């Protein structure tokens, strides 16, 4: 689960990464992003079906050049996918990922967001060889912006 989130913290637009969230909620977030193409491709079909039914059965668009008729079906196809993607997020999913990111650290700039799988760590002999981010080359610390609350 490698997804960068853009959350609305009041007036600020904060950023985070799904690797900073526990694995129990990463699966729920990944499941939502997996249903976006199912709503996008499904909406493209309706936009393609309803458009083909209109440029043929309605005898006002059928009496037009094919290039104008094909442009309507082409426009209504991808427009039907963009609309279905909005209905998917705006209904309850854009707010569900915000609630699932509750407790995760956020950052003011996207460039400051680390990927937990890309961080350098070592096996600390003084702590039963547990993985530790505080390796012998660290100087100051991480110091994120704040913990997200929704």
């Amino acid at each position: 689960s490698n997804i960068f989130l853009e959350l609305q913290d009041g007036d600020k637009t904060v950023y985070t990464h799904t690797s900073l969230i526990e694995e129990s909620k990463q699966e729920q977030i990944q499941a939502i992003y997996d249903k976006v193409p199912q709503w996008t491709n499904g909406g493209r079909f309706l936009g393609f079906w309803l458009s083909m039914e209109a440029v043929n059965r309605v005898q006002s668009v059928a009496k037009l050049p094919i290039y104008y008729r094909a442009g309507i079906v082409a426009t209504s196809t991808l427009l039907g996918g963009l609309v279905s993607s909005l209905v998917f997020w705006k209904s309850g999913n854009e707010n569900q990922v915000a609630k699932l990111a509750n407790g995760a650290p956020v950052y003011l700039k996207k460039w400051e967001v680390p990927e937990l799988s890309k961080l350098y760590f070592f096996l600390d002999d003084d702590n039963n060889f547990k993985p530790s981010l505080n390796h012998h080359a660290v100087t100051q610390g991480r110091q994120y912006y704040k913990i997200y609350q929704h």
Partner: protein, 74 residues
């Protein structure tokens, strides 16, 4: 033949010449025998200084990365 430059200097070969006859010459070699033991002892009385002064500790866990040298195969 250690302490070469010290022995040569004590024999006076930096400013003069040794006697040309083996008798006095070989006595002069054995004459610096006491001074070599003294100068050797003086050089073993140096006080210690922090080793982490001009040399990073190679046993530090920071260097466990075993990083290699990235090169360009021109």
């Amino acid at each position: 033949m250690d302490n070469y430059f010290t022995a040569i200097t004590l024999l006076g070969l930096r400013d003069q010449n040794l006697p040309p006859f083996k008798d006095a010459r070989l006595q002069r070699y054995k004459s610096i025998k006491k001074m070599i033991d003294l100068i050797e002892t003086t050089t073993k009385l140096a006080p210690p200084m922090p080793v982490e002064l001009f040399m990073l500790n190679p046993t530090d866990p920071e260097w466990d990365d075993d990083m290699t040298y990235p090169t360009i195969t021109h």
